[PDB]
Amino acid sequence: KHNMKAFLDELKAENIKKFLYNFTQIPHLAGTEQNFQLAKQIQSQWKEFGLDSVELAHYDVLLSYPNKTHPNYISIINEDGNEIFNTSLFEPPPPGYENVSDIVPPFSAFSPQGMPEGDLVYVNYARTEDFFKLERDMKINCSGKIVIARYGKVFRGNKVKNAQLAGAKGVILYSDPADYFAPGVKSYPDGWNLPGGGVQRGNILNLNGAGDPLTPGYPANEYAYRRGIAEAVGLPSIPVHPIGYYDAQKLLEKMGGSAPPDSSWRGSLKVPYNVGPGFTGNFSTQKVKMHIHSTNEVTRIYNVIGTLRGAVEPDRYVILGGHRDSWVFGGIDPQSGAAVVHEIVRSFGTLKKEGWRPRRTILFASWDAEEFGLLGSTEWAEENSRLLQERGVAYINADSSIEGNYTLRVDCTPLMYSLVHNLTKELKSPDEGFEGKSLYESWTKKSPSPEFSGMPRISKLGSGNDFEVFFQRLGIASGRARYTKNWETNKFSGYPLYHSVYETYELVEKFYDPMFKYHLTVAQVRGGMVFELANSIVLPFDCRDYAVVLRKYADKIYSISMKHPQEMKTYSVSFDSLFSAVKNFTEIASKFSERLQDFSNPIVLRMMNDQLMFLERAFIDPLGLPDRPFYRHVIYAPSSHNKYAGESFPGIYDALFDIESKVDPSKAWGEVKRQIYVAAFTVQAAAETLSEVA
Amino acid sequence: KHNMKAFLDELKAENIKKFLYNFTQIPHLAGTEQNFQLAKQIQSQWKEFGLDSVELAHYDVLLSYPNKTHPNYISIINEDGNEIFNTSLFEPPPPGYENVSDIVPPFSAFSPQGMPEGDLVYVNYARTEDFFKLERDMKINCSGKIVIARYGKVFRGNKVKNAQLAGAKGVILYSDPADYFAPGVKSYPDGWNLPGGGVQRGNILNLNGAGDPLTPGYPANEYAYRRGIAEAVGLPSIPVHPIGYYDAQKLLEKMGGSAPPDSSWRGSLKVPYNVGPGFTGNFSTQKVKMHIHSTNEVTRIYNVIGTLRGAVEPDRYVILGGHRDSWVFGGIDPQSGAAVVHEIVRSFGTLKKEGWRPRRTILFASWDAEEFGLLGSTEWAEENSRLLQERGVAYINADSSIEGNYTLRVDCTPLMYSLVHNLTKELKSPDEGFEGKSLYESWTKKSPSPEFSGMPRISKLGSGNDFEVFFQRLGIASGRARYTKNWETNKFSGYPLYHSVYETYELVEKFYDPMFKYHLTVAQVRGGMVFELANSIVLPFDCRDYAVVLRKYADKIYSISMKHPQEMKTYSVSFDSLFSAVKNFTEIASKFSERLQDFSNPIVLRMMNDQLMFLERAFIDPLGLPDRPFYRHVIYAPSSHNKYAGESFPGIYDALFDIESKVDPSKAWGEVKRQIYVAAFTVQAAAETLSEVA
Ligand SMILES: *[C@@H]1O[C@H](CO)[C@@H](O[C@@H]2O[C@H](CO)[C@@H](O[C@@H]3O[C@H](CO)[C@@H](O)[C@H](O[C@H]4O[C@H](CO)[C@@H](O)[C@H](O)[C@@H]4O)[C@@H]3O)[C@H](O)[C@H]2NC(C)=O)[C@H](O)[C@H]1NC(C)=O
Ligand SMILES: *[C@@H]1O[C@H](CO)[C@@H](O[C@@H]2O[C@H](CO)[C@@H](O[C@@H]3O[C@H](CO)[C@@H](O)[C@H](O[C@H]4O[C@H](CO)[C@@H](O)[C@H](O)[C@@H]4O)[C@@H]3O)[C@H](O)[C@H]2NC(C)=O)[C@H](O)[C@H]1NC(C)=O
Ligand SMILES: *[C@@H]1O[C@H](CO)[C@@H](O[C@@H]2O[C@H](CO)[C@@H](O[C@@H]3O[C@H](CO)[C@@H](O)[C@H](O)[C@@H]3O)[C@H](O)[C@H]2NC(C)=O)[C@H](O)[C@H]1NC(C)=O
Ligand SMILES: *[C@@H]1O[C@H](CO)[C@@H](O[C@@H]2O[C@H](CO)[C@@H](O[C@@H]3O[C@H](CO)[C@@H](O)[C@H](O)[C@@H]3O)[C@H](O)[C@H]2NC(C)=O)[C@H](O)[C@H]1NC(C)=O
Ligand SMILES: *[C@@H]1O[C@H](CO)[C@@H](O[C@@H]2O[C@H](CO)[C@@H](O)[C@H](O)[C@H]2NC(C)=O)[C@H](O)[C@H]1NC(C)=O
Ligand SMILES: *[C@@H]1O[C@H](CO)[C@@H](O[C@@H]2O[C@H](CO)[C@@H](O)[C@H](O)[C@H]2NC(C)=O)[C@H](O)[C@H]1NC(C)=O
Ligand SMILES: *[C@@H]1O[C@H](CO)[C@@H](O[C@@H]2O[C@H](CO)[C@@H](O)[C@H](O)[C@H]2NC(C)=O)[C@H](O)[C@H]1NC(C)=O
Ligand SMILES: *[C@@H]1O[C@H](CO)[C@@H](O[C@@H]2O[C@H](CO)[C@@H](O)[C@H](O)[C@H]2NC(C)=O)[C@H](O)[C@H]1NC(C)=O
Ligand SMILES: O=C(O)CC[C@H](NC(=O)N[C@@H](CSCc1ccc(F)cc1)C(=O)O)C(=O)O
Ligand SMILES: O=C(O)CC[C@H](NC(=O)N[C@@H](CSCc1ccc(F)cc1)C(=O)O)C(=O)O
Ligand SMILES: *[C@@H]1O[C@H](CO)[C@@H](O)[C@H](O)[C@H]1NC(C)=O
Ligand SMILES: *[C@@H]1O[C@H](CO)[C@@H](O)[C@H](O)[C@H]1NC(C)=O
Ligand SMILES: *[C@@H]1O[C@H](CO)[C@@H](O)[C@H](O)[C@H]1NC(C)=O
Ligand SMILES: *[C@@H]1O[C@H](CO)[C@@H](O)[C@H](O)[C@H]1NC(C)=O
Ligand SMILES: *[C@@H]1O[C@H](CO)[C@@H](O)[C@H](O)[C@H]1NC(C)=O
Ligand SMILES: *[C@@H]1O[C@H](CO)[C@@H](O)[C@H](O)[C@H]1NC(C)=O
Ligand SMILES: [Ca+2]
Ligand SMILES: [Ca+2]
Ligand SMILES: [Cl-]
Ligand SMILES: [Cl-]
Ligand SMILES: [Zn+2]
Ligand SMILES: [Zn+2]
Ligand SMILES: [Zn+2]
Ligand SMILES: [Zn+2]
């Protein structure tokens, strides 16, 4: 028999291990020859594995690279202009790789060039609330200062945007051991912690979904018209550079001015964590000087796109996608995900060679340039948006399969909650102590739902990965799953060796998943999801689960507004329309579910499958959110303060945020009311797609 | 048998006559009680005729009405401020209606209030090229002048926009006999010509597809957030008022300054047609003074929406829509169309009572407030956009059925050209001299295609009617057909009694169509189209006809650019990508057509029907055209100089228009190149929707 069990049993931990080793021997930086060679290898193997067609889709996009003959670094500079301390020019390479070439040194991709010199201000994690505390409570002015900020908590591009709007002239990002050194574990090569010479690479763009900075809205193909650099989307205006904690210690130890306002501002280094501006009396005349010489360059990137044509509904696409480009060796990020995808393709191809085809078409993608802003997935989606709009059932992402070894982590649309619960009840837990128990059971025990007893936690989708264009721009039901750690407050900060040269095959094989059983479990969850989506006769979406969360989000946004009762009285701010819409959605979704269970008629079925597929689509507003035209979903958007986190009712949330500080309250509350109207209208309109059609 | 012949034979001229009489006894101005009563009557009759459901959909939109106790008028005012001549306060009512109440006097809907006084400038038809001639060649300055312009050639809202941008302080529109008095025919009541006291009403908005000025993007429902008046879309900033040619003669006869630049500026009145500014020497101190006191008011409007549920594909909608609101009695506009729709509903309902149902769902609509800017159709489409986007097959409009008695006039998407040719070959011509000949034969003889021998003329869709939101915003295949005159250069000017009190049942019954045979022919064309769209197993669209016109439009826009060869050399302006895309579209459409003819499989059929239905949809760009976000179709938009006319490749056309006058040619040509990229990309993307799906 060719059923899900057949598919799942064909998946092998040993194959995932072999592929991970194969993908992590050399760096695969986007836009380099090594990454094009790997693209061609994947294309060849996917063909051999049995896919119907496998093509490369290429685009020419803006990328950013250090200057190989003019290195980036930071100095402390004395009175006469002597550089008395310099940060490192590279991370000490790990054992056995000290002769690997083409390791890109640490840098902040898309930083402009410059050599700003000035006094430091320490800004904690450079969050919106950190800058509020500095400016509003401590009365510290960042204008013309170099800001130094620890990585963690929020996406680094939000830190840089926040520093820019505070008037900083440069930003120094560093990894504090408080956030990147787990107590009781040794530094790499002897454990999974970050060494003091380790540094986290990463882009610092604020693209808000646009894709290639030069071609927002349209694919960066051969004849594309490109914006000039000055009109490009999302580029920072001040130099930025990341460093390790040995270097950070040197920059922070001399800091003077005000003490940290409280303990949540102190990391684990043996320094005071003074906010400054500048150094204590004796060194008051020393300054910090950045030297940044990276260049932005239009460069070709390559996505691999494989197709397994559906036997019954070939014009319905279920997509499994994840990226292939890495900062250096990509031992976790992305190759632990890419190896999982490779073994999924292999398993589907085995069934296919025995005569099976899925009901719907499955597209597999190896995206390029994810690390430079989701560029490959986004340009491809821009090129194919009409096909995806009218045919896309679902998108399952497949970046890193592991960031820990504790339990499952799933973020998805409410439409997939039931599918995930059901699938996980049928899979074996890989966890010690849960042998012979289901994955659902271990996951629910280790990660309890905050709302419901006997259910696991499933989070909203944010952004910072390749599902963004499919979900937030195009309104295609999306999900992601991986194995994760038990470190709640580190949820968005990365595992310690994130985007460092130390993220290697050996890291994974020695410290994370020596038996590749967590990888295998993730392959079963991602592959199982794709299988059910592509093969179930009725699409495995439950609209009633959206109704439940919509009520939760409506209660939440109302509660935020109700912190301002006088203003809601003055400006007649009512949430009645939104609750009415949610109530109607709940009622109509209940009735639709009855019909779906109560309906041999392929037209009624497909009519109903189209209602299910277009339901996520109905939450899209073609006008986008305010000043973010590529974030079009009215229920979910990446937080304006942290791209990694999702926000619900984002248009109303942003209208309410810090509203007590707005100069014209009439205008500000008017915009809250506008956003309430838009949300109520969109929820009612989405509900009406589930009504009987005629 | 229940086939198209059965449907067509049930249609009766005598019924169309009865309904036209019934709909034209009293005025039905949008937002008045009389128009709500007619809505309720139609709703009741459509129920009795057999439709499955018939509901009213209401909205509260910005409308505009004169002040009943403070009348609008224009004066010539002497030196001391004595008003020595006043324009009329109303049109002399026609015989037997001199005691009808609630006839709205002539006014320009949405005019602001004001009493500007100044010197006149005569601006011909107030077209872009008329203002070019005045300002650039004659060096006449309109700043602070009252402009007087004859109606005709272009939509009146474009005239007002052009006057506003010339710096006019008011606009006077009038009907010249050159454009509204056909030689050899008598004035109304004794013929179909405009009397000198007759005046054409009409709105002067520039909404560019937005719908209700206060709620762009969203339906004007009960909880809608409305823009304040100062941020409303499309409102004119200077007072405007229309008058008849008896009054115009009085204003024009004294005109001094420069002579008309040439004869195309002279109408048929016994005046010099001097451009001025101001009056000849003796009257040099007299001025013209407007008195406008109309008010804009949010007012409820009502659409009637009837549904005939499809037997096989109930989730596919074929829509027949036209408006019900009239300026006064609406004898031609809209009731000659509404009576046709009423008899179509009756015929479909007769078949239905005998057990028949169409394959797909047919929606019938009686729209409100068309005269105030397409408000009813647009608000409804805003409310239902997700259903229409994913389910709308086609929209057939049904405003006035006749504007003459000479031959057929059809404007539609290329996807419907074959359907129209085939249907008209099967219908009888109503024309004298063509008895026993097909409508195709008479139409082709009287209105030859300019490209093809043995084919009739079919024009592009522009705007100025209720199909605009469906076609240009949402990308639903649309068409319209009516009987028309033989008066080429009057194509966009209206029949003489257009929007006047003289447009009555008697006008039609005596002078246009005494036997109602032209009405019947139009009912057969509109109803026949709806029947085939709603009942053909394969949708009756031919994609190859789009390929042919795309090549024609590409040649045309290239030819415009090639008037500037030096600039195309300097800025490397290439149309190669656009011709490549058109070539690919032609190739793929040829292959798709072969498969469509060469393919018992309902999934393949419907897959292919979805490819056909979504092909018009593929020409939509979600980002819209520059500064016109609601005009989203890349191939067709209403001309920026004349809303009634369609423009092809509008984004490139507007980038090229008057480019030799732009201050920064580098920037201007860069935008031409951008628009070429967008067009080539969109044509290629639409082509790819016709490729095999997987
Ligand atoms: C949730 O679904 C329900 C349907 O089950 C839907 O109910 C609709 O509510 C609207 C808005 O309240 C109703 O609108 C009314 O319609 C009547 C005519 O049917 C009008 O006369 C009413 O207008 C009068 O009253 C208003 C309020 O006092 C005045 O402001 C106005 O000036 C008029 O005097 C009003 O327009 C509509 O009838 C129902 N439809 C039903 C019950 O079928 C509700 O809107 C949905 N929620 C959302 C957010 O869409
Ligand atoms: C119409 O359909 C045809 C397909 O039948 C489609 O043809 C495609 O054209 C593009 C653009 O010309 C081709 O792109 C090339 O792809 C190759 C790899 O396949 C690249 O090496 C090429 O890049 C090199 O050459 C460029 C031009 O000199 C350089 O600028 C560049 O730096 C590189 O050196 C180039 O990207 C593509 O291969 C074909 N695809 C085919 C034949 O299948 C055409 O684009 C369609 N028209 C439109 C408007 O879409
Ligand atoms: C996750 O698994 C659950 C448990 O199997 C699925 O819910 C179950 O779905 C079946 C099929 O619809 C339901 O059976 C139906 O019951 C009604 C009787 O009320 C009958 O009319 C139908 O003919 C059919 O037998 C069953 O009730 C339901 N169980 C529940 C809700 O507790 C669920 O669909 C799965 N989710 C997926 C596949 O996305
Ligand atoms: C308008 O009417 C014309 C003339 O009838 C229609 O074109 C004709 O359509 C039929 C049905 O597809 C074609 O017949 C097919 O011919 C091929 C043989 O090459 C065969 O493989 C198929 O099985 C089928 O018999 C016919 O060739 C074609 N005639 C033409 C193009 O001259 C046209 O479809 C109508 N347009 C509509 C309905 O929108
Ligand atoms: C990763 O595995 C691939 C595929 O097995 C290896 O590429 C093959 O290498 C052999 C020996 O050079 C060649 O004969 C084949 O042509 C290659 N196949 C391809 C590219 O499809 C590759 O060597 C492995 N890489 C590493 C680092 O082990
Ligand atoms: C930090 O690096 C800088 C740059 O290489 C060093 O300063 C240079 O030293 C060389 C050789 O002594 C001089 O010729 C250059 O003029 C200096 N360049 C600049 C820009 O100052 C500096 O010595 C290093 N500091 C430490 C402590 O190692
Ligand atoms: C237009 O026709 C309608 C329908 O025949 C007429 O309305 C009907 O009038 C009679 C007599 O008053 C009533 O008994 C019915 O209730 C009406 N039916 C409706 C409204 O559905 C209407 O009188 C006609 N109007 C004119 C001007 O002739
Ligand atoms: C044009 O109409 C105006 C407005 O009604 C007339 O002027 C008014 O005449 C009355 C009565 O004689 C005066 O009391 C008002 O003061 C005048 N109003 C204004 C605003 O001027 C005028 O007489 C009419 N002109 C002609 C030629 O009929
Ligand atoms: O440019 C972008 O939007 C993201 C590019 C690149 N994305 C990325 O590294 N994503 C990593 C983020 S690590 C933090 C995180 C965030 C959300 C989550 F569910 C799990 C982990 C990932 O999703 O696995 C980056 O964050 O630098
Ligand atoms: O507000 C608008 O966009 C149009 C409202 C109203 N529309 C209208 O009268 N349309 C009439 C326009 S008469 C000129 C014309 C234009 C195009 C055409 F095919 C036939 C006639 C119609 O289409 O029958 C108007 O023009 O004032
Ligand atoms: C890299 O280093 C120096 C800095 O000016 C120079 O030789 C070369 O132009 C640089 N390369 C760039 C800017 O890509
Ligand atoms: C911050 O500092 C700069 C110093 O030049 C000044 O221009 C700016 O106004 C200051 N802002 C505040 C809030 O003190
Ligand atoms: C794997 O699990 C064990 C047991 O809880 C833990 O001690 C170890 O640190 C984990 N490895 C990683 C990388 O989290
Ligand atoms: C109509 O006429 C006069 C003008 O001021 C006044 O009595 C009334 O306010 C007006 N009605 C309006 C402005 O709707
Ligand atoms: C037109 O006339 C007004 C008169 O005040 C003036 O402001 C404007 O600059 C003039 N424009 C031209 C082109 O003469
Ligand atoms: C109807 O047709 C006749 C014959 O051509 C023509 O003389 C008459 O003017 C037409 N009526 C109208 C309103 O066009
Ligand atoms: Ca792009
Ligand atoms: Ca609106
Ligand atoms: Cl992921
Ligand atoms: Cl029409
Ligand atoms: Zn990644
Ligand atoms: Zn990453
Ligand atoms: Zn009309
Ligand atoms: Zn009209």
Side-chain angles (χ1 to χ4, degrees), chain B residues 641-658:
Chain B
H641 306 283
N642 175 14
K643 189 178 196 187
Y644 293 147
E647 188 54 74
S648 49
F649 290 125
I652 309 172
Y653 184 94
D654 284 343
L656 284 166
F657 182 82
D658 196 40

Coordinates of all heavy atoms in Angstrom, one line a residue, chain B residues 641-658:
Chain B
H641 N -6.9 61.5 -19.8 CA -7.5 62.7 -20.4 C -8.9 62.6 -20.7 O -9.6 63.6 -21.1 CB -6.7 63.0 -21.7 CG -5.2 63.0 -21.4 ND1 -4.6 64.1 -20.9 CD2 -4.3 62.1 -21.6 CE1 -3.3 63.9 -20.7 NE2 -3.1 62.6 -21.1
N642 N -9.5 61.4 -20.5 CA -10.9 61.3 -20.9 C -11.4 59.9 -20.4 O -11.2 58.9 -21.0 CB -11.1 61.2 -22.4 CG -12.6 60.9 -22.9 OD1 -13.5 61.0 -22.1 ND2 -12.8 60.6 -24.2
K643 N -12.1 60.0 -19.2 CA -12.6 58.7 -18.6 C -13.4 57.8 -19.5 O -13.4 56.6 -19.3 CB -13.4 59.1 -17.3 CG -13.8 58.0 -16.4 CD -14.6 58.5 -15.2 CE -14.6 57.4 -14.1 NZ -15.5 57.8 -13.0
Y644 N -14.1 58.4 -20.5 CA -14.9 57.5 -21.3 C -14.1 56.6 -22.3 O -14.6 55.6 -22.7 CB -15.8 58.4 -22.2 CG -16.9 59.2 -21.5 CD1 -17.3 60.4 -21.9 CD2 -17.6 58.6 -20.4 CE1 -18.3 61.2 -21.3 CE2 -18.6 59.3 -19.7 CZ -19.0 60.6 -20.2 OH -19.9 61.3 -19.5
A645 N -12.9 57.0 -22.6 CA -12.1 56.3 -23.6 C -11.2 55.3 -23.0 O -10.5 55.6 -21.9 CB -11.3 57.3 -24.4
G646 N -11.0 54.1 -23.6 CA -10.0 53.3 -23.0 C -8.6 53.6 -23.6 O -8.5 54.1 -24.7
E647 N -7.6 53.4 -22.8 CA -6.2 53.5 -23.3 C -5.5 52.2 -23.1 O -5.7 51.5 -22.1 CB -5.4 54.6 -22.5 CG -4.0 54.9 -23.1 CD -4.2 55.2 -24.6 OE1 -4.6 56.4 -24.9 OE2 -3.9 54.4 -25.5
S648 N -4.7 51.7 -24.1 CA -4.0 50.5 -24.0 C -2.5 50.7 -23.5 O -2.0 51.8 -23.7 CB -3.9 49.7 -25.3 OG -3.5 50.5 -26.4
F649 N -1.9 49.8 -22.8 CA -0.6 50.0 -22.1 C -0.6 51.3 -21.4 O 0.3 52.1 -21.6 CB 0.6 49.7 -23.0 CG 0.7 48.3 -23.3 CD1 0.8 47.8 -24.7 CD2 0.8 47.3 -22.3 CE1 0.9 46.5 -25.0 CE2 1.0 45.9 -22.6 CZ 1.0 45.5 -23.9
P650 N -1.6 51.6 -20.6 CA -1.7 53.0 -20.0 C -0.6 53.4 -19.2 O -0.3 54.7 -19.2 CB -3.0 52.8 -19.1 CG -3.1 51.4 -18.7 CD -2.7 50.7 -20.1
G651 N 0.1 52.5 -18.5 CA 1.3 53.0 -17.7 C 2.4 53.5 -18.6 O 3.0 54.6 -18.3
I652 N 2.6 52.8 -19.7 CA 3.7 53.3 -20.7 C 3.1 54.6 -21.4 O 3.8 55.5 -21.6 CB 4.0 52.2 -21.7 CG1 4.4 50.9 -21.0 CG2 5.3 52.7 -22.5 CD1 4.5 49.8 -22.2
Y653 N 1.9 54.5 -21.8 CA 1.3 55.7 -22.5 C 1.4 57.0 -21.7 O 1.9 58.0 -22.2 CB -0.2 55.4 -22.8 CG -0.7 56.6 -23.6 CD1 -0.8 56.6 -25.0 CD2 -1.2 57.8 -23.0 CE1 -1.2 57.7 -25.8 CE2 -1.7 58.9 -23.7 CZ -1.7 58.8 -25.1 OH -2.2 59.9 -25.9
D654 N 1.0 56.9 -20.4 CA 1.1 58.1 -19.6 C 2.6 58.5 -19.3 O 2.9 59.7 -19.2 CB 0.3 57.9 -18.3 CG -1.2 58.0 -18.5 OD1 -1.6 58.6 -19.5 OD2 -1.9 57.6 -17.5
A655 N 3.5 57.5 -19.3 CA 4.9 57.9 -19.1 C 5.4 58.7 -20.3 O 6.3 59.5 -20.1 CB 5.7 56.6 -18.8
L656 N 4.9 58.3 -21.5 CA 5.4 59.0 -22.7 C 4.7 60.3 -23.0 O 5.1 61.1 -23.9 CB 5.1 58.0 -23.9 CG 6.2 56.9 -24.0 CD1 5.7 55.8 -24.9 CD2 7.5 57.5 -24.5
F657 N 3.5 60.5 -22.4 CA 2.6 61.6 -22.9 C 3.3 62.9 -22.5 O 3.7 63.1 -21.4 CB 1.2 61.5 -22.2 CG 0.3 62.6 -22.7 CD1 -0.4 62.5 -23.9 CD2 0.3 63.8 -22.0 CE1 -1.2 63.5 -24.4 CE2 -0.5 64.9 -22.5 CZ -1.2 64.7 -23.7
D658 N 3.4 63.8 -23.6 CA 4.0 65.1 -23.3 C 5.4 65.1 -22.7 O 5.9 66.0 -22.0 CB 3.1 66.0 -22.5 CG 3.5 67.5 -22.6 OD1 3.8 68.0 -23.7 OD2 3.4 68.2 -21.5

